[PDB]
Amino acid sequence: FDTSPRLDCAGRILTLDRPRVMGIVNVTPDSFTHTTVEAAVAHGLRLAEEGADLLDIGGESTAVPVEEELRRVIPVIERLVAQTALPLSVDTFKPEVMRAAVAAGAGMINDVQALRQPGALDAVADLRVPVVLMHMPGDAPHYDDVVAEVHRFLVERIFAAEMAGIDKRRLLIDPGFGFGKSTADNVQLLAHLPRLCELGVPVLAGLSRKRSIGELTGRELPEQRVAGSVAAHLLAAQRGALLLRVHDVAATVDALTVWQAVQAVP
Amino acid sequence: SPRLDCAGRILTLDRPRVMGIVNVTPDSFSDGGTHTTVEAAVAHGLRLAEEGADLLDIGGETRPGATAVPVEEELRRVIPVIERLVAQTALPLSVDTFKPEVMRAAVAAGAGMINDVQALRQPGALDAVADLRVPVVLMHMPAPHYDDVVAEVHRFLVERIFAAEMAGIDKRRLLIDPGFGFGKSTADNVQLLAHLPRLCELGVPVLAGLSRKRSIGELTGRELPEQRVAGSVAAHLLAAQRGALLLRVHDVAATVDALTVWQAVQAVP
């Protein structure tokens, strides 16, 4: 990029002059929802304190009705927009959630379906907020060439978005690590990540605590995969990723900080 | 690929290997009320072996502007630890000492490598390593002013490799180390890490040790050594990418995980 990507997230600017950190804020009720909202807000505040550049708020596991997804994400977005100065992303594939979340203060859409849900293209075109287009087969299959297939899919979605009137400067792409991909397919996409960076749009990588990291390192549980995840995110940043979707914000910031100091030496 | 015979225990440097830090000092442990220093160091070395260390570095000489440890006290610390670890692990064991008497006693006790912060400059160290026929790490230590820290460290290591070869130490048994944090500012440490490939051109394996060091703390704003784990793991991965074949670390499991992810990625044609 001659000029670094400058994403206007509803007035909150995300500058991709260096790899940035997107902190994961999950609002899905589990075995342990008003208490869920309170816990998600406290978690988002902790990630902001840890140095996140953006928070990604999601109320659906990646099928809940739109009204239930709104009951989860809207109070979290309303509280975080008032209590942080950070750009906020909403992790949803539903156009009605995208519209309601942006009206509540979200400044970016993170869509696992890459605007394939009926009405999603029209909603994002109308909202004029940045959007992440992720690769997911349908909604782990065999690939003849996973890198070529993900590349082809992302070209199609970028084009579909541009033809719907979404400015190319508002797009981000993501290969979708862990979504219908074996450990070998994920490793291939990470090794060949510079090839996806040639589409003229910033690349987001999310390998945080994923099963493939667990398989490479022999770590069964998500919190046991932190070291391997921080390493994977550093490797992704070295290979062109400009946004990193992580649970372990402070650790990722530290790793990128050390790398930035080293990379700065002529 | 370098094949280091550490007194019968083979260390193959076909990929970066992890050297686990085993400090045998009372200040290294907080369980001294009911444990001995030796027993705590042995249990720690066993934990590092379980975490996947490729070798253990046992040292008895840890404090700001540290008081010199007398030889008899250094032996009292490292020898029982080496004797127990050689019997309870299959790993090559390094002794971190600059004293020839400790080098000889440690090798007789089961150590298979010498890690010398003084690069064999202590009188008798060249004769001990030549006699012992074990691998040896030659580290740089002079924070003083450098006109060119990279060129100065390179020049020192060429001089010490030459001194070791001239004393009869086989070049195949040598390792070099720029000595991160030893009389070096954060800027000097960053320069040496960024220019590490230049040191890898001396035909000898390179060891990098940046584990929980002050420079990592300065780069990340982490005051306490235990808060520097992520920055240290990142520094060690960067060193490995820049040619280091040995990594001297406290956080063995985390470093092994990082190198494992990198190995999988680097293996893609």
Ligand SMILES: O=C(O)c1cc2ccccc2[nH]1
């Ligand atoms: O670790 C030590 O030196 C130490 C622990 C402890 C506990 C109770 C009394 C004395 C003690 N000393």
Ligand SMILES: Nc1nc(Cl)c2nc[nH]c2n1
């Ligand atoms: N964009 C995005 N990327 C990844 Cl990997 C994800 N994993 C869960 N949600 C996600 N959203």
Ligand SMILES: Nc1nc(Cl)c2nc[nH]c2n1
């Ligand atoms: N070889 C070696 N290298 C480093 Cl950085 C060290 N730091 C403490 N002891 C050490 N020994």
